[model samples]
Target: LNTYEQINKVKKILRKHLKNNLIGTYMFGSGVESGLKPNSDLDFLVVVSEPLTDQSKEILIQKIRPISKKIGDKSNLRYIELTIIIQQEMVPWNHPPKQEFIYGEWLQELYEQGYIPQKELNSDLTIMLYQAKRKNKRIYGNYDLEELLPDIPFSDVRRAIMDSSEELIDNYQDDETNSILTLCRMILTMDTGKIIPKDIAGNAVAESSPLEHRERILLAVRSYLGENIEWTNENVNLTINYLNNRLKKL
Candidate 1:
C-alpha cells in the first residue's frame, strides 16, 4: 500500500532495538517497482560488530523478537528474510549481488586468515551465502561495509564507459560507443581460456580479457543501438543473447 507510511515509526522501533546492538547502517528498499505489486515479505538487514558465537546469538535474537513485536507482521506479510554478515567478510564476496548478506551480533573475526575456501559440506549451496553472512552479522552489525561496498548498479553508465575507455584499446581512438571490440580480442587470446564467475552464464557474458569483453559488447551494442538508434524493442530481448554469444565469442 503505502511504503512510506509508518516508516518513521518503524525506524524508531528499529533504532531502539538496534541501539545497544551493533547494527551499522540500514538500507531499506523492496524490489517492488512503481508498476509492480507490493511485496508480502519485508526485507531487512542486521549488521554486527563482528562474527558471532552461538552463545551471543541466542541473546541477540531473543532481544530482537520483542522489538519486532512492536511492528507485528500482520499484512502484506509472507516471511522475513533477515540477512546477516560480518562487515569485513564482505571484502570479497564471491557472488556480485548478495541478497542475504547482512551483519549480526554473535561472533568474532569472519574467517581465520588463510582459512581454506571450502564450500560448506553438502549444504544448500543457494542458501549458504545467506547463512555465511548471518554468522558475520552476528558480530559486525555496527561496522560499515567499507571497501566491500562497490559503486553499485556498476553498469548503468557503461555505454559512456565502453566508449571512452577505447583509448586503452587497439591504441587507436574511435567514436566506437563501446570497448567491446577490444575485450573480445583478449578473451580469444587467453591461454587456456578464462574462467568466469558463476554469476554470468546463460543469462550473461563470460569474456575474460577486458578488451575482448569491450569489443564484442560494443559490436552488439552498436548493432542494438543499430546503425542508427540506441535501443529498440528487439534489442531488449537480445541483451541476454548478446552477453552470452556475442560477447563470449568475439
Candidate 2:
C-alpha cells in the first residue's frame, strides 16, 4: 500500500476498535504534506476518552497487527509508529507538573509493547503540543486537540529545539541524515520562533545564511530528501558545531 493508503487503513481499524473510547485522531508530519519518501513510515495520533484496560489494549493491538505487518513489508521500519494520548491528562497546562508525552519516542516504545508505559513527562511536551495543534488534521472526530492545548511560550519552544538536539549529533552520526536537516529547522525556529519543515528551513539557510555553511546545509537537505550523496565526517562535525553554537545563544 502507498503511505496514505496505509495510514487510512490503520485509521479505519482504530476507529472500529476504539469506538466511543476514541476521543480524537490526527495525521501530521511528512505524509500529510506529500513530502514522504520511501524512508518515511506512517504516523498518526490517537487520543482516547480515558485509559483503556489491558484487554482492550490487547484487542486494539491485535486489530492493528495484520495492517502493521503488511505495511512493514512495504516500508522501512523498526516498527509501525502510532501516538496514543489520554485527553484528560493532556488538555490542561499544568506547568509545575508536566504530563506524560504520548508521542514520538515514548509512543514508539508503547507501540513496541502493548500497554502504555507508566506516565512520565516528555521534555518537549509544550513545543510538540503547540506544533501538533498548529499542523495536525483531526481525522476521526471533529473536536480539535489543538483547542485543548495551551499556547507554548517562545522560551519553551527554544528549549524544546535545544533539548531535542542534545544527543542527535552522535545518535544520528551516520544514518539519521534527516536529523541533521531537523537541526537546520530547529536553528531557524530559534531565530524566528516558527517551527517549519526541514526543506523550507534548508531553503531559507541556503539563500541567506553564511555562504560557507550553505553547501553543507544543502547536503543535509539532500540527504533528508533521499538523495544519494557523499558526506564527510568533517562536514558533519562542522554542522553540529554550528548548530550547537546557534542553540547556545537561544
- Residue 67 miss distance in model 2 (angstroms): 3.8
Candidate with top lDDT is: 2
The 10-residue segment with the lowest total lDDT in model 2: 95-104
Q: Write the per-residue lDDT of candidate 1 for residues 140-225, one digit (tens) a residue.
A: 34344333343323232232223333333443223323333333332332322332212122113334324544344444544423
Candidate 2: residue 21 Cα off by (Å)? 1.6
In candidate 1, residue 103 scores what lDDT?
23
Q: State the local distance difference test value for candidate 1.
A: 0.35
- Candidate 2 residues lying further than 4 Å off, grouped into runs, are 31-42, 54-80, 94-118, 230-233
lDDT against the true structure, each candidate: 0.35, 0.63
For 34-57, candidate 2 gives per-residue lDDT tens digits of: 556665546676777776665565
